[PDB]
Structure formats: C-alpha cells, structure tokens
Amino acid sequence: SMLKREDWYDLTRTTNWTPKYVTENELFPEEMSGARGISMEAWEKYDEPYKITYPEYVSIQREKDSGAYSIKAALERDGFVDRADPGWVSTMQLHFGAIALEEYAASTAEARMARFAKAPGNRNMATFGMMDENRHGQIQLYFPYANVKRSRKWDWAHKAIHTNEEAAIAARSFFDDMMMTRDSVAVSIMLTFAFETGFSNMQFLGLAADAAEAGDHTFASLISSIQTDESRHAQQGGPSLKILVENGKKDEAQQMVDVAIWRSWKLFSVLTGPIMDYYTPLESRNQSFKEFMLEWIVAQFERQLLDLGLDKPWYWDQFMQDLDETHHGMHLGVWYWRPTVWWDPAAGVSPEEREWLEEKYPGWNDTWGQCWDVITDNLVNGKPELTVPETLPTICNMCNLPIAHTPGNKWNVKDYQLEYEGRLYHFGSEADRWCFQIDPERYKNHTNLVDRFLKGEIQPADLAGALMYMSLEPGVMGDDAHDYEWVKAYQ
C-alpha cells in the first residue's frame, strides 16, 4: 500500500533552516530573493493551490510527450504545411521565432525562484516550472525544425533572439525586464501572475483553437499540450501577492503588477492582435481581438485583483479605449515595414475583410481605412515602391515598438516625450513613459534601434545596412503574405 498524497506532501516543502555558518542575507541576497524585510517564518505561510510531486510529474509528462510526438510523426509525411493558407504559415513562423528561446530562458527565470525564494513551496513549484519551460523551449524547437528545408525563415525559430531584428529587441526587452533581471519574488508576480496567468494561458487556448480551425493538427496538438502545463507554475504569483499585502506592502505589490500588465499588453498587441484581425482567414474568425480581450482576459484580471485585495491599475480606462486602436497600429507598422520581419505579413484589407473590420470596430474605415486606401491605389496604379519604406519609425524607448495611434479623420497620434539627464526619450503611451519614470535607473542606459542608427552604430547607415545589422537577408525578408492576391479586387 501507498500513502495518500495529502499525508506527506507538507514534508516535501518543510525545507527552511536557520543558517549559522553564513548569514541569512548571504544565503538569500536581497537582489535575488527580494524578501522585502518580511521574515523567513512569514514566507512559510506561502501555500500553492495546485500541488504535484516528483513521481506524478514524470509520469504525466511522459504521457503528454508520447502524445504530441506521436502525432507529429503521424502527420509529418502528409506535409500539411505545404498547403496551409499563408496567413497561417506566417502566424506560425512568427510564433516560433519570438517565443521558442524565450520559453527556454523562462527555465532560468524559474531557476531563480527555485534558488532564491524564501517560501519553500515556491522553491519546489519553481523546480517543476523550470522543467516545464525546459520542455516548452525544447519542443518548440523540435517542431519547426521539421520545416528547415522548406524555407530559411524556419531557421529563425532558433536565430531570432540571437539577432537585433526589431521584434527580437521588443521581445528581449519584455522578457529580460519581467523575468530575467528581477528578484525571485518580483518574478513570481511579474511573470507567473501578470503574464502567464494574465495572458499566455488564454492566448495559448485561443491559438490552439485557431490551429485546429486552420487544419494544422500537428500545431493544434503542440500548443494544446504545452497549455496543459501552464497553471502548475503560473500559480506562483498569487501566494506571493497575498503575503505582500497581508504584510503591508500592498503598494510595491500594486506597482509591479501595474508595470507587469502594461508591458505585457504592449507585447501582446503586436504578437496576437494583428494575427486575430488580419492573418486568420475571414471565415475562421470567431471574434475580434477586442472581443477576445474583454471576454477572456480583462474580466479575469478584475476578478483576480479584487480577490487579492488589489485595485485596477490607474491606466485601466485608457487600456479599455486602446483596445480599439493599438493593434491596428502595430499591424500597419509590421506590414508596411515587412521586409524587416522574418515572415510574410498578411495585409488583410480585402473588401469583405474591410466591412468585418468596420462591424467589429465602427469608425475604422474613416481612420485606419484611409492609409490603406492610399496603399491600395498605389498597387492598383502600378507604383508599389511607395508601399515599402524609406525611413525608420520612432521606436518607444519602453516597449521598443513603433509610436502609433489612430490617424485619418480622428487622427490622434501622440508621443509622450521625456527629457532626463540631457537626453530625450520617446514613449508610445502614457503608461510606457510612467514605467521608465518610476524606475529610471533600470532603463536609462539602453538604446533602441533608432538611437543606435542615430548614433552611428548601424553602418552603412542606409536601409540595406540596417538590414545586415539585423541579420536579415533575401529569402527571410518579409513580403505580403498573399502575393497581393487581395489587390485584384480593386483591380
């Protein structure tokens, strides 16, 4: 006979001891633990809601991988990739590039909590979390690798984050901030609570439905499996948060959460937004990226927060508005700047798509509709050089994304400039600026793509030179996903 789990679980996490031969602060340096003056004993109240133990873990996760890999091998010879709508293929190539090595780097993020958290429950959970992100990175390399002979773009599942291409910087800007450069307690909150619970759990679900809808079962199974691992380690922020409030640090708690959501929001607005509203086929779309947000992301935040004893962030209202406007910005950026990304952006402004865009976001053609009109005339009329660019957009120094908002009729493109020690920074939104301002030393020193150009770091200082600085090359340089098929409809 075996014991029932409940009977022994606590001894797995009864692991704290009073050091003597070194001191608490030596063993738990504040820069890595972030114990915040709260005591060892008071972190021992840390109690995770979802519990697992070594033998269960290795047993379950063996199954998950047998499934996934068996399916991959089963479908391989049918080469579905070869026929998929290239809106899809692109969706995928962007995902692997931006995410695979960040998943990997997440294991280190977890590794951090695993060594430096004063909460023993947290330490062990983090070890599994660590194993989870090891899987994710590994599997999300093994899968794209199936496709390397199909196109060089797939090599980017690996290269992307080893480059200075705009997206890689935006990516590393976000992850390094949330999960690589923060103390243990900070990480639990800014990564597992804010980002993983906040966003990627529901995104991964949505992505898996989309994959299925599109007929890529290999990919549907992939995302779907990974998703099953999320809560096991995503849980880790909750208990941390409780302990901080219960213990008179509601403000610091509050602040990291504010920062965490905004930065996560901005990355999300360029990686998921444009896919939902432009790369997915018109018939395959269940809802708008805005409908998806409200329903599946935003209520959940208020739910989560009220329950923790926190308040909605100061910017919440703006956020609500920006749902109508940001991602259309983000999308227009990427498409217009397409030879500088590693997949083929789908334009998504065929007529039918255009009225869908109007239904979901009333006021669209009279704003975002304009710019696209001009682009369209340009390809109608045989002058398509006026739909690639000849300069660089202003990059926000926080999110490392283009500063952009609504234009046309209600044009309202704003820039939240700030001067700080005889240098001028540019901020794509109020919230981005405020992030820098509350923690200036964390960012001061850093330079985004435009700064580097402006400083002579990119040589030759023309567009072809920026292309080599970003490791891009013909064959990976992005063009219109449908080869201007949607053009014929205006003529």
């Binding site: 001009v374 682009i375 234009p407 402006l454």
Partner: protein, 83 residues
C-alpha cells in the same frame, strides 16, 4: 544635418526625418511629406503644411529655420494642414 520626429496629420505613425540646420519650416514639411504623402496620407493642394512643436503646441512661422527654432535633437514636431 539634424534628426527630428515627424507627426504627420492623418498618418498613424511618427517617423524619423533627417533635415538640415538651414531648412525652412516649409522645406522641413517637404522632407516629411515625402515619407507620408502618397505613401499613406492623401495630398491636399487646397492647403498649406504648417509646422508645430509637438511637446507644448507652439506654432512655427513658415519661414524660420531649424537653427532659429531652438530645437532639442530628435525632437518631435507636428506637421499639420492649414491655409
């Protein structure tokens, strides 16, 4: 030479436009529109392109030059429509 950031009316995105210390507000606007008119904004030859400091709202006489404008490098400027 001088870097500035161009906030062009009815465009979505601020851009980087090199100009020269000697250019007029008028010639600035010429350089700007190159990257926004007929790429993404419709021309308005019923109109004239003015130049205002983005930070505080301040409007610039069509004829003054960069050097006279007291500009912070990299500074963002509006490029609007009037008559």
């Amino acid at each position: 030479t001088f870097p500035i950031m161009s906030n062009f009316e009815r465009d979505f995105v601020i851009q980087l436009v090199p100009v020269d210390t000697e250019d007029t507000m008028d010639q600035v606007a010429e350089k700007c529109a190159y990257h926004s008119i007929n790429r993404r904004v419709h021309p308005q030859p019923e109109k004239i392109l003015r130049v205002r400091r983005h930070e505080d709202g301040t409007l610039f006489p069509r004829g003054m030059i960069v050097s006279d404008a007291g500009l912070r490098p990299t500074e963002t400027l509006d490029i609007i429509f009037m008559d």
